[PDB]
Design a protein around this ligand. Structure first.
Ligand SMILES: OC[C@H]1O[C@@](CO)(O[C@H]2O[C@H](CO)[C@@H](O)[C@H](O)[C@H]2O)[C@@H](O)[C@@H]1O
Ligand code: NA
Length: 283
């Protein structure tokens, strides 16, 4: 019942919900129980990289991979020497010999871009990684890697409340690249938790958040609307929703497996929600 999408033009076919951004805890036995359940749910994409300051314990993930490596798409994150030495450390902890998707974090336009690209290409030629991508909300970085590199994915914060990525979707898609979503529920603001009084989100004030929760369609839970809004864009290959329990993972799976938005439902959310753009790092 978990559908998959092609990650860019790569050979990786990733579950629409990916797993990351959940603590596996201190007990290895409990951690492996959590991972077994994740995989049992049909999630096959595991990103160990920090998302919102929460990553996955690589030693624990490594033990969960045992006997089924080929069935899992493993992503991690990281001048040529640094990029090479870094993935070696992850592989040792993960007890495997290749990463499916190796992603650059912290890229800027002032980095040594040719050197960086060459590092990833050499790792890919040698089979240490299968593909590479970036994690970025900087259009100037995105444009450079799309023009100059063979990235297959860009990880971006994206939700009903942060539509800044959408400006770049046509460009990304024209290059045959996919987006991997973080923050699809806006860190809880698109769920059942209260809106903290007086606090906003990006260019929303508190009162605008309150109003938008009320005005959005009420025929689906807000959490489901949020995940299905992300998925309603073909450029999106997978969404990495946050979870701090197996119950929360199952809730995410159920919402991703619900009926997709129609064209109409999508156009409706598009009208109701703000459509902001990135102010910084555009060029
Ligand atoms: O120029 C006003 C115009 O901007 C929007 C963009 O969504 O709202 C922004 O500006 C308001 C006035 O400063 C703020 O109250 C609001 O929080 C902010 O997003 C539009 O709603 C508005 O028409
Ligand atoms: Na534009």
């Amino acid at each position: 019942h978990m559908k998959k999408r092609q990650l860019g033009t790569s050979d990786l076919h990733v579950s629409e919900l990916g797993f990351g951004c959940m603590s596996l805890g201190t007990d290895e036995t409990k951690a492996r129980r959590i991972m077994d359940e994740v995989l049992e749910l049909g999630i096959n994409y595991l990103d160990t990289a920090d998302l919102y300051n929460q990553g996955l314990n690589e030693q624990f993930v490594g033990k969960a991979l045992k006997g089924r490596r080929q069935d899992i798409i493993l992503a991690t994150k990281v001048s040529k020497a640094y990029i090479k030495e870094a993935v070696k450390d992850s592989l040792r902890r993960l007890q495997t010999d290749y990463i499916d998707l190796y992603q650059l974090h912290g890229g800027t336009i002032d980095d040594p871009i040719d050197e960086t690209i060459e590092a990833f290409e050499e790792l890919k030629q040698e089979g240490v990684i299968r593909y590479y991508g970036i994690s970025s909300i900087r259009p100037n970085v995105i444009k450079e890697y799309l023009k100059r590199s063979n990235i297959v994915s860009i990880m971006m914060q994206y939700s009903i409340l942060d539509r800044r990525p959408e400006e770049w979707f046509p460009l990304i898609q024209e290059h045959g690249v996919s987006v991997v979503v973080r923050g699809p529920v806006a860190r809880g603001l698109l769920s059942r938790r209260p809106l903290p009084e007086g606090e906003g989100y990006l260019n929303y004030r508190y009162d605008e958040l309150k109003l938008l929760r009320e005005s959005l369609p009420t025929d689906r839970p807000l959490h489901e609307l949020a995940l299905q809004y992300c998925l309603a864009h073909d450029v999106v290959a997978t969404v990495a929703a946050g979870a701090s329990s197996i119950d929360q993972v199952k809730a995410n799976v159920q919402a991703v497996e619900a009926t997709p938005l129609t064209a109409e439902e999508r156009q409706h959310i598009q009208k109701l929600a703000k459509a902001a753009v990135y102010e910084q790092h555009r060029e």
